[PDB]
Write a protein that binds this ligand. Structure first.
Ligand code: SF4
Ligand code: F3S
Length: 106
């Protein structure tokens, strides 16, 4: 699996969904997640994210390890997203701010 990590939150550009061949992104109000059993590890989403928030599971930084289980959990509960949409309004303001997990909305 690939995994969405902290910098997506309050950015949610949604560029990643457009290259996914298996439609395995699931949508929250201010974040996306990857369903790990559906993901085929094609790696195509990784370079598309402007937030650079996506990592191979085995490359998730130590300080963002909690995101691996969090993607698995939220992928079960959130609706599928398969089309690009506008980024969140103040995305540029939040891109690169750390610790945005505190702002995650269910
Ligand atoms: S690695 Fe491929 S299959 Fe997995 S989420 Fe990214 S684009 Fe979709
Ligand atoms: S910000 Fe989030 S919505 Fe996709 S393009 Fe990046 S993982």
């Amino acid at each position: 699996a690939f995994v969405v990590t902290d910098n997506c939150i309050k950015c949610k550009y949604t560029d990643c969904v457009e290259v996914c061949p298996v439609d395995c992104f699931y949508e929250g109000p201010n974040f996306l997640v990857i369903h790990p059993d559906e993901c085929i590890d094609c790696a195509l989403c990784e370079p598309e994210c402007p937030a650079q928030a996506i990592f191979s599971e085995d490359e998730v930084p130590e300080d963002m390890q909690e995101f691996i289980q969090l993607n698995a959990e939220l992928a079960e509960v959130w609706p599928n997203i398969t089309e690009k949409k506008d980024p969140l309004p103040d995305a540029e303001d939040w891109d690169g701010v750390k610790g945005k997990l505190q702002h995650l909305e269910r």
